[PDB]
Amino acid sequence: KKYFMSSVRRMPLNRAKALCSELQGTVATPRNAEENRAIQNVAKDVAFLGITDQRTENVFEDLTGNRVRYTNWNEGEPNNVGSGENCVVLLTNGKWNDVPCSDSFLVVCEFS
Amino acid sequence: KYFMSSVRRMPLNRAKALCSELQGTVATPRNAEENRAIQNVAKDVAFLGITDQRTENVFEDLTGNRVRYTNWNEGEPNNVGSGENCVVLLTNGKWNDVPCSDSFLVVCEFS
Ligand SMILES: OC[C@H]1O[C@@H](O)[C@H](O)[C@@H](O)[C@H]1O
Ligand SMILES: OC[C@H]1O[C@@H](O)[C@H](O)[C@@H](O)[C@H]1O
Ligand SMILES: [Ca+2]
Ligand SMILES: [Ca+2]
Ligand SMILES: [Ca+2]
Ligand SMILES: [Ca+2]
Ligand SMILES: [Cl-]
């Protein structure tokens, strides 16, 4: 099964990726609501998910460039505000928000 | 318990910080079955969450609990040189005490 673990510190997505890969894992990418809730259980605050629309705007893929199916966007999201929001975080209510990849949040890693 | 190995080598302090970052700890085998599981996740020599930094020749886990199960390689522990207060799991599954300042892979443990 997949196991999820949350970081203690906040960091931008690239450092988040590096953290998870250090232990040979990836940044958590929920494929359904059960997994979304399992990530909620470990995330004590807003945290990064392994999803971005960095390739093509409004097309969300996991970190391996694989287009995602399941989404749980917060109302009004994704909205790509300002200079752009191409990363995704799981809010404390379990819904997602697109955010700048350079902003810092906790990170949930996934292993299997 | 779930065990994960790092890809890079680092001294024990950095090793502890890494596992703690994801709210886990440096792996401490409590029996032969756990020892094997950690050995398998580690592709090379890796630190275990055991030291005798507090009291020489008194090996305990990172929370100060004296370890019962041990799997020392023959001749170990030997505290050579100016001291070896950290512990690594060799590629043959046996343990060796080493300087905490030396770099090895790290296997983290999670519950
Ligand atoms: O900077 C704060 C903003 O962040 C955006 O990502 C979000 O869509 C907005 O609703 C607002 O929360
Ligand atoms: O530095 C090399 C030495 O490392 C020690 O920890 C070990 O006990 C010795 O047998 C030798 O391998
Ligand atoms: Ca975007
Ligand atoms: Ca947004
Ligand atoms: Ca010693
Ligand atoms: Ca030794
Ligand atoms: Cl030492």
What resolution, expressed in A, was reported for this entry? 1.8
Distances from the Cα of A33 to the Cα of A20, A69, A70, A95, angstroms:
22, 12, 8, 10
Pick from B77, B76, B51: nearest CA to B66: B51
Q: Does A6 touch chain B (CB under 8 A)?
A: yes
CA distance A68 to chain B (A): 25
Distances from the Cα of B51 to the Cα of A2, B12, B76, B87, angstroms:
31, 10, 13, 6
* A40: DSSP letter: H
Nearby residues of A33 by Cβ (< 8 Å), 6 or more positions away: A70, A72
Q: Are A101 and A1 in contact (CB under 8 A)?
A: no
CA atoms of B45 and B92, how far apart (whole Å):
9
Any bridge partners for residue A26, and if so which?
A: A110
Any bridge partners for residue B104, and if so which?
A: B10
- Helix (H) / strand (E) element for B76: namely none
* A90 backbone φψ class: left, alpha, beta (φ>0; ψ -120 to 50): beta
Q: Are A98 and A78 in contact (CB under 8 A)?
A: yes
Alpha helices of B22-111 — where are they, by DSSP H? 32-41
Any bridge partners for residue A98, and if so which?
A: A88
Q: Burial code of A71-101, b = ≥16 C-beta within 10 A, e = fewer?
A: ebebeebbeeeeeebbbbbbbeeebbbbbbb
Look at the block and give the residue holding tokens 């070896």: B84
The radius of gyration of chain B from alpha carbons, rounded to an integer in Å, stands at 12
AA identity, residue A32: N
Q: Report how this structure was experimentally obtained.
A: X-ray
A49, two tokens: 């998910």
Strand B86-89 with B46-51, pairing: antiparallel
Domain spanning A1-112 has what CATH number? Answer: 3.10.100.10
Nearest to B22 among A21, A23, A24 (CB): A23
Pick from A11, A8, A7: nearest CA to A28: A7
Q: Does A49 touch chain B (CB under 8 A)?
A: no
Angle at B108 between CA B104 and CA B111, to 5 degrees: 170
CA distance A24 to chain B (A): 7
Look at the block and give the residue holding tokens 């392994």: A50
Q: Are A60 and A51 in contact (CB under 8 A)?
A: yes
Q: Does B69 touch chain A (CB under 8 A)?
A: no
CA atoms of A100 and B2, how far apart (whole Å):
32
CATH superfamily membership of B1-111:
Mannose-Binding Protein A, subunit A (3.10.100.10)
Report residues whose beta carbon is within 6 angstroms of any ligand 1 atom: A 77, 79, 81, 85, 97, 99
Q: A7–B22: do the CB atoms touch at under 8 Å? A: yes
SS3 letters across chain B: CEEEECCCCECHHHHHHHHHHCCCEECCCCCHHHHHHHHHHCCCCEEEEEECCCCCCCCEECCCCECCCCCECCCCCCCCCCCCCEEEECCCCCEEEECCCCCEEEEEEEC
B24, two tokens: 């886990």
Atom of ligand 1 nearest to the CA of A78: 8
Interval between CA B71 and ligand 5 midpoint (Å): 16
